[model samples]
Target: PTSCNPSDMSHGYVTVKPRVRLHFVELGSGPAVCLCHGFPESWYSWRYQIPALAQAGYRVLAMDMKGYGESSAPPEIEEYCMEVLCKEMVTFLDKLGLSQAVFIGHDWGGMLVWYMALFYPERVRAVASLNTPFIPANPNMSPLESIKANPVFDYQLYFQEPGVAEAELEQNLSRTFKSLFRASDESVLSMHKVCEAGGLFVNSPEEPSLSRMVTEEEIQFYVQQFKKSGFRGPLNWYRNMERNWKWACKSLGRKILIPALMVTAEKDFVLVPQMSQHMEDWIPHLKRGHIEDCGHWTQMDKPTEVNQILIKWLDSDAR
Candidate 1:
């Protein structure tokens, strides 16, 4: 057995910028691999990968990212802009006394790492993103406009409204997390329809996650974390769609020149595997991975497969 427990790891904090503090849990000691989590999660998202990667002779820094768990949540949509978000990670690395590190992320974290490979190539050695794919933005339409045009992503539009989503979700943290972390599909894809009649958590049934993806104790951990952090900070990320689009368009093509990986869940509704196919056009060095029967929570549910593939790829020179 390994000497580390992912449920318990070495925690550290850093001030990425003025009024922006980030919380991170790290393990082992080797080539730095920062693990960033997406919306509605904390460093706990990488619970399984933390021990796995650490035992594989690699250093893993699983971060709470700004605005989530223990991290400072600046109360402004603009604070979560794409430029500053990546800048915070870049700053985090500078503080760590490291020059470059591999970035692996799932969900919103995945999206951020993909952008990192594009915006700050010098700081990133390689990047692996789970679920979230980097497709080209519409040349004319902005990201906000693009999502607004799609009914499937209507929940994102709903989240654009500040107090609305926070109040709805905060009413019952347990129920919110119970509904949020699940497997066997449907919850994510039909979120648009779920948002139509009131809100995403309005009638979310408090039933067992069909796949039991997270235990009751894990769910409570999320509940307590959000109890103080609230939903606004995380929701603010979605609010900056246009700002991100403008910043991203500066490079026009937004190609990821560094080594990159895209891991898709075969059953993810919104970020389905097909959503990842076109990314190869812009990322010549891209490597694609698919996890069979998995949902949006790729790393959480299939840690063994994710660990093997990620470690194997990280160890490869691609020559």
Candidate 2:
């Protein structure tokens, strides 16, 4: 297991251990708030919110869930399934000795939070989901396929194709992270737009491609970690979609009747703001918030507003 402090550059705030063991970014003292990051991102993605939440008196616990960042990257893709992901959360809580805790997730993290509420409600005190929303298991849906909508996920569909996304991506860590974390259209262009057939890199003429929000050092950190683990672990998350759906239908297909918070990003393409449309039936106690001008990375795009909304929602006593 590798461990380091995140306060300094040399001290990356993580403890790399077994893919099963959990690493966290802890701050403040009070009730627990487990922050979950989505695809092509790491717990480091929440860099802005950690101190903010800690200052607000929350025991902020942001983690690198098994294949991303310094967390262990298991050889098996099944390790990344929703059930496995939820179990990891439970294990983290168990290690913390907490009976229940609030969940805050962005993107895939949001999906996991939704599943936790449905299957592991006893461990969830409340939930705040950014971007992605809970979709009930349907008999007609395909296997857990990676999301690949435009303005957000052309790359994802590219990821699902035989070997294009991983082949071009795995060549180098920087390019891989760029492919995953970059927010601008140019970043999208870099991938061979099968939709258009032009060389992906050639289409990267768009300006301000991706944000400078992520520092070079941060990018390197992600690259190094991801390069070590390879994309298989994280990619496994996409592979398990159908398996999880089937498992849910047979065993844990229950609606989340708990207090819930769904935060939609108006500008997010992958998870359209309208995605929350059917949530009312799923979450009995549901509240909604939207951040304008924000994309997939809601926590980073609008940290203050996100924090405020989460704080207020978590504080509310109303059912």
Candidate 3:
């Protein structure tokens, strides 16, 4: 229970709003730091960082981010929109009695953390993200439309239709876990092949290979969580992109005054490094870190590198 588990954090839930309860695993103590996870994952994704950051003298709260883990999954699709999810930042802080917490995230969570800073500026003192870079929102075409127009983003297109991704994903939990946990490949993105094959479970390997960075126990844990929660809520995050895009489009010229860290992976085709090129224009107090020979799951793929960068930033910022 103490050592073999790797994840030695304790679990707790806070009422983020009226009906929404966010589940998080905590460790250590000091300045508050909240870790948010992306799609097909829970707080467990932050297991490596939890103890490291906590041991560095920070109280870490790694959340399941509603709809993905033990947190409440609303019945409606729009309920998962950016505005509604961002409100959890204020209420969760109110419940915890913390004025502000440094927010760090990866993948979908990466996008959330940036918006969290902008949407609830005062509640988030600073923000850090892996893979995802906050480019503000484009006013030309809604994000989903652009994704629809591009053939490479076929996976996102597949996710746009409700009931399709859920049924295809939930049909085989292990396959779902195997399908997602991997290094990003531009030539053959994970779900793009899934869409091309007509479905994930259709022609996927009998035992889809786990990412070199991913462990068997880790994959099993994800399987267990999704077994009950299903894919409905997690898929909704993709469905509500337009709402968030429009909101982001409105705030194009605004700047994020808080200190920010953006870590980019060299091989993450999904959120390529160049995506962060114009980030300085939006976040004046920004610092960037690059991880060579890494993929989309930057933190999970390379923890020591990521941990070092984070604590060093926090350490220096403390001065």
Candidate 4:
């Protein structure tokens, strides 16, 4: 019914609800598999897996979450709350006629998919996340307090400040992606200290060239999309931490009852693998995997290994 033309990768927009229209790139056929990307990223984050998953005989849909890429970006910070975000996913599936899906997410998207199982378990058949972990909400602490309790997540505090990080990142798009999306190494991890101390790109004055981890064309693509969209909507996700905390607190003692796979990046300074250690207590059906010598950009930094793990898992009983 939509005007989209089918291809190896087909682009279209769907009105998930009255006001929200999520843009998605779909490929392949068979069981529905929805991919969600994390902060400061678009659906393009899953560029590598779209075709692979499609060819493997699954209906793969990678969406630009509300406020990113061609998706509708609501101005109010409250609109980006976790509860609303989860409903959007549910509505996205209903609109597409998918009763249930194997959901995958990375970064903030990882956080969302984990909560997806908790809030709407019936809609998700299986869930996999990269970098981020399933940390049950603390009834006693606000989200910011829980994040600030650890030095590794201090950058999250920086992101909470409105317009501060948005202005800084919007100043230079290429530099922002170049610095944030680079390969994981000791040197890069050390450099992230500045990001920890300040907001992302607080240390760099000029744009760095594209790293080998990403292609020149790919970097340019990210830069162009960000230049048009700006960082306000994405940063709004960080600002709603307290709201998310309150929502989680209200529904205390919830768990993700779906089969879960968590892939950790060794060089990821934030959301380190150790954060997931306690996750087994909460996610009883979790299967953990590690990507050594990799950074937060798990799929992009190590596509082949990530794909292998994903395919093997999808083929297993987990689905």
Candidate 5:
């Protein structure tokens, strides 16, 4: 990824290692605040939050994680493990001359930030996440087995297949975006069944596009990126479930000792607010916020509310 127009923030790539190059878009020039996005999303996922944070006097650096967007997509599944991912983040900061800074993330990115705070506490100034809660490692069980046993995460099973989701999603990129980026409250019959049987939009023909979480133009941006990159690299993240679990077990009994903030979505069924119940016990300095009538994509669904909450918390001296 080369540099884009300076007006749209500096967009370019950084060679993290021998064969790996990560892409990032940076704005403003103050205390560096890094934004990490979830699966199937690019740095553009932070479109709303970037400008807001920039104007608020904090430098924002949003990156396309290893597999998604314009970043390097390593073919090996081992490269996507939690240990490797955490090292990549630290290397990203080091390469950019950021000693320690505020880190914010959502979904898979949310989970990664927690791991950053846990393993590299000295490098993360403060941490915050949306939707995803802190889940301790189970020495006896793998996450894949646990997710397969539950219907709520039925979608993960679909994503776990090697080339199945890639073929299904790439076949119709436009419809896949519409189906995946829906609001949580949006109703659709057999969504769990559809995801388990085929892909997110296997039932697209029968399911009308009802939610308006993203604009047509914005949807095109996502479509173009995924179409170019394909879904294999992103799906590989899911393939490392057992690898992540086993590596995380090293810190099984550890606690996150950083000042943290978590924003939960009221309408998100998968990563429900209840998941953060025991967070306070592990994160002694935890601040919690809730978004009403919001869904899995809390930041995009309710940008204004999420921004206000994030800005106030980020600017506060307490954390």
Candidate 6:
């Protein structure tokens, strides 16, 4: 089990000049690896991989992307647009004096990684995503518009419906975290029920659940970090879906021909493992793998195995 004492880790915030401050945790040196986290999460999401990458003599950077954790959350929904977020990552790289770095993303972070490749390919050495896949942006529509057509995505429509999830999530942070942390039939049902009309939550008693993969202290750390920023920043990511899709149309036909590795969760309830079914066609240079016992949060659910795979991929390329 990973130790949870805050004093045990080396972490701090970086005030990176003019509207670019972020709270980040770093470890080791030699080649920078940018760790971008997904929704309802902060830099702490990469807590499992930091020490491992550091031990391997690689500089690991895990950041609380714009709206979550200690990062500055710009209030405008357009500010969270893909182009803007992608620039933040590239700008972060420039600030770190890294000409290029391997990028790793989970969830929303993974979505941004895809945009990063499109907007700033030269700055990306490689990429590995947890559950997200590259989605061709359609300026003419919103993802939720199509997503809602499918029964599985009824929750997303609810999320975009406005005022619904925000109100419920704020009222029940603990239960919200419970449903967001992992997955269950109740979790799906609860979300499906409320999100159908465009919301992401429906009220329920907060369940007694520890981070199945993270300890109690770590969970508190996430809760505390979230309390500092609230859900506005994170949810802003969703609000920008329309803007991101339109911005992405600028690079619709680009191909990701770099050293790419994709690990799919065999049992991921959403972003189904089958999502990568056309990897060969979409990503020409793709190395695919799977984690059977994992869910959407592959990094946390199976850190040891995830670390091993990442190291192996990096090592093979290092040679």
Specify the highest-lDDT model's number.
5
Task: Give per-residue lDDT, candidate 2, residue 279.
Answer: 85
**Which pairs of residues have clashing backbones in candidate 3?**
none
lDDT of all predictions: 0.81, 0.69, 0.80, 0.81, 0.83, 0.73
The local lDDT score (0 to 100) that residue 26 gets in candidate 6 is 81
- Residue ranges of candidate 4 with Cα displaced over 4 Å: 1-8, 186-199
Output the better candidate (2/4) by lDDT: 4
lDDT per residue for candidate 3 within 1-319, as digits (tens), equals 0111535458889986677788888888899999989887888887778878888899989888879778988878998888888887678889889989999999889888999888788888789999888877779877867776655567877787889878878877876777666766512235446567776567557667766766788888888888767889989998887788888887778898888999999988767898789899989999988998888777677778888999999887631
Across residues 1-319, which tens digit of lDDT does each residue of candidate 5 receive? Answer: 1123324567868888898999989888678889999977888888888888888889889989998878988888788888998999899888888889899999999989999999999999999999999988878877877886767888777777688878887887777777778787664534457564565665556435736787787778888888767889888878888878887898977788877999999988878899889988889889988999998887789988988988898878323
Q: Choose 1 or 3, whichever is better by lDDT.
A: 1
Worst 10 residues of 2 by lDDT: 8-17
How does candidate 2 score on lDDT?
A: 0.69
TM per candidate comes to 0.93, 0.83, 0.92, 0.92, 0.93, 0.90
Count of clashing residue pairs in every prediction: 0, 9, 0, 0, 0, 6
Error of 6 at 95 (Å): 1.4
Q: Which residue runs of candidate 5 sit more than 4 Å off their true CA positions?
A: 1-7, 187-191, 194-196, 206-210, 317-319
Worst 10 residues of 3 by lDDT: 1-10
Give candidate 6 regions above 4 Å deviation.
1-4, 12-17, 138-142, 161-163, 183-190, 196-203
Q: Please provide, for model 4 over 163-243, each residue's C-alpha lDDT reduced to its tens digit, 9 standing for 90 to 100.
A: 888887787677778777877652233333535456555555474656787767787888878776789889888888878
Cα lDDT tens digits, model 2, 1-319, are: 1122465422223322353556666776788888888876777788777777767678878878677776777777677778877877787777668899888898888888888888888899888899888877766655433343233444445455434555655766675565445543323543324445522443443232345545567668787777766766666677676678787776444677778888888867657888689888867789999888776667666777887887778678311
RMSD of each: 2.2, 4.7, 2.5, 3.6, 3.1, 2.5
lDDT of 6 at 173: 64
Off by over 4 Å in 1: 1-7, 185-189, 206-211
In model 3, state the lDDT of residue 311: 91
Candidate 4 local distance difference test against the native: 0.81
Q: Model 1, poorest ten-residue lDDT window?
A: 1-10
